[model samples]
Target: MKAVGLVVEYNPFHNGHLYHAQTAKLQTGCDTAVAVMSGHFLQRGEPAVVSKWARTKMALQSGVDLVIELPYLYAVQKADIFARGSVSILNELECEALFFGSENGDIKPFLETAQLIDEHKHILNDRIKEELKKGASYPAAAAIAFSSILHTESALDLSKPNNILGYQYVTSILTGGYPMKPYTTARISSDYHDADLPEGENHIASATSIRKAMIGQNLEACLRFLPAASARELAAYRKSFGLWHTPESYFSYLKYSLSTVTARELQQVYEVEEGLEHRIIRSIRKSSSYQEFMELLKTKRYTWTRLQRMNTHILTRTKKQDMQKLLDNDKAPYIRLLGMTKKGQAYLSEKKKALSVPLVSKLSSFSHPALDLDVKASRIYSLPIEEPLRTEFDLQEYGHAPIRYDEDEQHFLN
Candidate 1:
């Protein structure tokens, strides 16, 4: 029943993902690898190239034995909040350790950095405020402040993307004294944010590169990064409907939402901080494209990535009041079991009695506010699936079954 847990978005499970999952299991010496995956949207504030169920199937076909949904709210938030919700799920499920891919694979520096951050939050908070005044966003400022605050013999800087998230993961573990330990798999391929396919670089291409392929409708390149089984599914998805959907595909939806939602309303949405609502309201009329709209909103303090995520909040109607009320409770409202093998089901069922929060398997079974938002999120995600090719993913909570794969039936699980 012992397991190593991972927090992943496997936008489309790829060659590198298979290796990472397999390696995490081996590294942790755990019986199963459970992934807490993002749903329709990713932490980067963009729609996943494929639905969660489709990606869950790909994950099962890879090496992960179970796939749990890291609820829509947590999956799309900043690193600290994202880590809190993800690590909470794994810890609640009794996972033995949490593993992640990091550009710098060593675990010691993250551990040290996390502890240092926890001990000196007061000082860091002061520096972060100063940095924010100089036009840095909270996360960027926090990272910059931490790097300077700890500029000693340490080689690891929290400002790097993977390290920031990894640092948050360790911060959650260290601060809460969570039972699950930590491990890292060294990253390969191009940079995490690279826009082109990594030629002769890695078996694993960055998800960013894969998304670039999807957004550009470059099937040949997309297939090259994915395992054949996952690629086949994507091919089927493409054949039935033009192709898998991307956030870019629904630019009109974002545009429409921005135009209709008043500046007052936009201010009420999550991530719409400071005078951002005014800028978006200012840009909504003349902006003819998503890129133009984002460019107009972008500033050193408000990165394009942050603006895009905020635009998604507008498109999704994720109100600030609703999010604040939920976070105020200080715990994951619930955890949903997206997909699992027989082994995972057995392990989860055995641990059911000791769990701290509810575990929902069926969509119809959940009634909480958090889940209500998640259902809405799915509907928005399913919007661009283009009728003929769209599966019951929008209706998945009611009828879909958990993904299951025989250990010996497919790709190498070792």
Candidate 2:
């Protein structure tokens, strides 16, 4: 029983994710696929649409065999580090294969381009700095620099988000010295940034599109896009807690934190730079909404998304020094389990005794600064997310024993 690993943020599990899982198995001939997923916060540097526990149930009900939490620090960074954290854990779990969705679905170019970047990293770095100086975003600069350094007539397009993530996965696999093989599946249905559902009833829609529908409470708009079980599970999650959340959920928290934060304190927060602390101070006072504040802080040096991350860290009271110290000590620290099926449990049983880092199924005694931050971050994500404070803060669902599934018994949270 070969186990394959995929890194994902189900946000809310939908048909497209199910397709990705089914194809990962079909393409790689692996019997089981385990996914290392983002926690309550994601790479976007915002709270998830719902709790991480809610998404985990969606994943297991859909197709994945196991779901583990990708710690907050690495989970909320840019693509390279995001890939770094994910690939490392998948490697830690002893996954034999890694799979992801890509724009072109060709793994050959990803491999070749990754090797090219490694060979001419100095040249790539110089070009990246040049492009950044020219006002291009870091991601854009890196992509252009890679293409220029390669000077190859390949179909690789790092300009696109999916391809860029695919590129990072390849780079991380090579850099981490993981023997896990890579596989790519052609993207089907909506584009990565597409905000509206496609016209075809049979096609899969983008997560963004489905999210908008969920936020609006328009069940019809999303019912067709999501698998029945996902739809059912999502509806139940909302019934138990509340509706799917959005970035704006933290607006009050950000403003309250901002109101109380001093300029020097802002400077101490992770991702705050360019003396942007003053802008945050000014913007929070002037702007009344999340959008207004985000726009006020936007500039060439500080992208909108970058500023959002800054705001999130401020809301969580995450200090820059502490974040760096955790990295300097234990990069990702431990792998925390959320939920898994019997197949997944047995898969880890064989390799349980010999892991590079801890496989955390409980949180009380875990001894890592990263784990501490994750708990703190979850407390912030927890606080009455429409659920009882006890359910979120007390159980953490993230801390207590992982929710386990046995075979075809779908007795997940009803």
Candidate 3:
């Protein structure tokens, strides 16, 4: 009853994802595969095309055995934190191994590079800061410094963002001293940032391209690239909610929140650092749109995405104190199951008692601390004037029909 873990944002599960899942099972010989997926929003600081529930269903119908939701806080954060959050969930699941897609597709090389970075942490940190001072983007600074120290250009490829993230996952797992084995699947067609879908290939277009195509109900273009299950899920969910609407509508709420919050208050939010709160407040007044505000606040030291995510944290009221408490006291409180097949259910029953974290499938069963935080986050999500606006947002509590794997169906995976 072995289980392998995957960290994903199946914004819309595609054929490429299906291939990766199938390959992961074959390579690891695992009976079940679990995914820690992003919720309504993603790492790029944008809302997902469809809801997390729909995406979870697609994963189960496609190839994955189980799905777990990565909290909105961590899902829309930077690489290091994102890796930490996902790795923590994988560890909690007691998974025997982790599998991901990588251009290099060589676990030994990735591990060796991670070890080199860890061994000379000071050198890498200093070099990155020095490069940043000279106006290099964070990614560029990291690439130059790491290449100089390790004498390898592997991390410099911005084209392969997933590979870079894959490396980070390996690094986090090693840094945390987790026992899970790392595995990689050779990337097939369609590059991570490629805008066009290649013809006649089982190419899974990148999330960016998919989102761009579906910006104005242009699902026709993305239909060919996504898995049939995902396509159906997207169509069904779109009918109830205007799935094509950009997160642009929520900018006012974000702006108002930032303008109203004091520097002292903003400073407490996760990722707000080095007087960034002051810049954010000023930018909110001067800029009109979310993208404009991000550009206005961008600096040599802080990447645009980093700043945007921080602003999102401020909007969502993610305080440093709360995040630190969760990190220290309960990084992985439980396995909040999003969806699972019958095979997955049987496997869970076999290993249920041996599990350290409870398998939660209903929202009502959430205990204190974790439950409190989950409720707070969900309330914030409901405030966004996006599609399917709920007048009175209620935490979804899993039940018998859904099979209360415990109580709630959604939560912060790590």
**What local distance difference test score does each model get?**
0.79, 0.80, 0.72
Candidate 2, 324-349: lDDT as tens digits: 77656424588788888877778778
Q: Tell me the tens digit of each residue's lDDT in model 1 across 377-413.
A: 8888777877744555466666765556666675322
Clash pairs (backbone) in predicted model 3: 361-408, 362-398, 362-407, 362-408, 363-397, 363-398, 363-407, 363-408
Candidate 3 TM-score, C-alpha based? 0.85
Clashes of each: 0, 0, 8
Q: List runs of model 2 lying over 4 Å from the truth.
A: 125-147, 151-153, 329-331, 384-394, 412-414
The local lDDT score (0 to 100) that residue 178 gets in candidate 2 is 86
Local error of candidate 3 at 198, Å?
Answer: 2.7
Q: Judged by TM-score relative to the true structure, which candidate is superior, 2 or 3?
A: 2
For model 1, state the Cα shift of residue 144 in Å.
7.3
TM-score of each prediction: 0.91, 0.92, 0.85
